[PDB]
Ligand binder design. Sequence first.
Ligand SMILES: [Cl-]
Ligand SMILES: [Mg+2]
Ligand SMILES: [Mg+2]
Ligand code: NA
Length: 328
Amino acid sequence: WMPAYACQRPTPLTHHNTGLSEALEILAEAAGFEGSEGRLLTFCRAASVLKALPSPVTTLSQLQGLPHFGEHSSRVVQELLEHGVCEEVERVRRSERYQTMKLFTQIFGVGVKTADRWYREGLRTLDDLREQPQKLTQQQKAGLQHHQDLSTPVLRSDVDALQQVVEEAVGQALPGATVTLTGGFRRGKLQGHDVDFLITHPKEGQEAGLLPRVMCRLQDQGLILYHQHAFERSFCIFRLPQPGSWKAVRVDLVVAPVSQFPFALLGWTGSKLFQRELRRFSRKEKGLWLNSHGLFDPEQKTFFQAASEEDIFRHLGLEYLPPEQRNA
DNA sequence: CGGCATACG
DNA sequence: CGTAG
DNA sequence: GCCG
Ligand SMILES: [Cl-]
Ligand SMILES: [Mg+2]
Ligand SMILES: [Mg+2]
Ligand code: NA
């Protein structure tokens, strides 16, 4: 009675198998660092299955019949249950390759392919990167300059303050436009790496051209430490007040027309695995194509209208899950 | 075996 | 190539 | 790495 797709089952933020899921997610991350997207997906899916269980796994027996647990993931769990550590996981953790790829990929502007190239060139530390800055993109220069602040968690107190300043700019840019908190905070997280906001307007079409107007106003208020600048997604670094000072915070701003707002809200609320699984479910089980703009029936060549996330779950024949249960 | 989500900057 | 969930 |  464990469904195979993560979007078919509630996954709360906190659960009963934290240590086991964390170990599998190390292997998933390492698989991604080597370009093994299929193995990354299986380890992520197996980890997420454990997050959805109603109690702790105490015996290997309890994995039988669970989807995404075969010989490899079962052996990892068996060793953690019997010995408290998995040798494979500890070897990954200790490896120079894992540690450096993790360090490099957590820089804003650096992905797996860039990190891997730097690794092969012999680079290992952030100061190694700062010693050859003409090699860096301006986005990477920003990510490196701000790396320390961006490594500090954002608190829910921080979010409320940023939401207020974003609403002020949005209101001047387009009266009546609204700002909705999305991402991990909408799933109930008390901390985050960034803050995600979704912007729309109740009159279809009025949101066209909005984001440049919003960003120009935030920049004029001195709040933008970095951004890339027609566009509809902005990946920014904001100045957030602190006692006697301030800190840099990643903020994403997205604009959607109100007709697409439920699809954008669903996508930007995540989790990442939940959205991948939902889109896979849509296509492979229902023959419908889902993204953050809409839901397409490729046979009738028609888009589904949705007025709510509830509509979208119903369209897909899935029982509704609130954001707090999408923590796959 | 093929498949593994699907966009925008 | 990077970014997003 | 696992599923269908
Ligand atoms: Cl793979
Ligand atoms: Mg976020
Ligand atoms: Mg984000
Ligand atoms: Na990065």
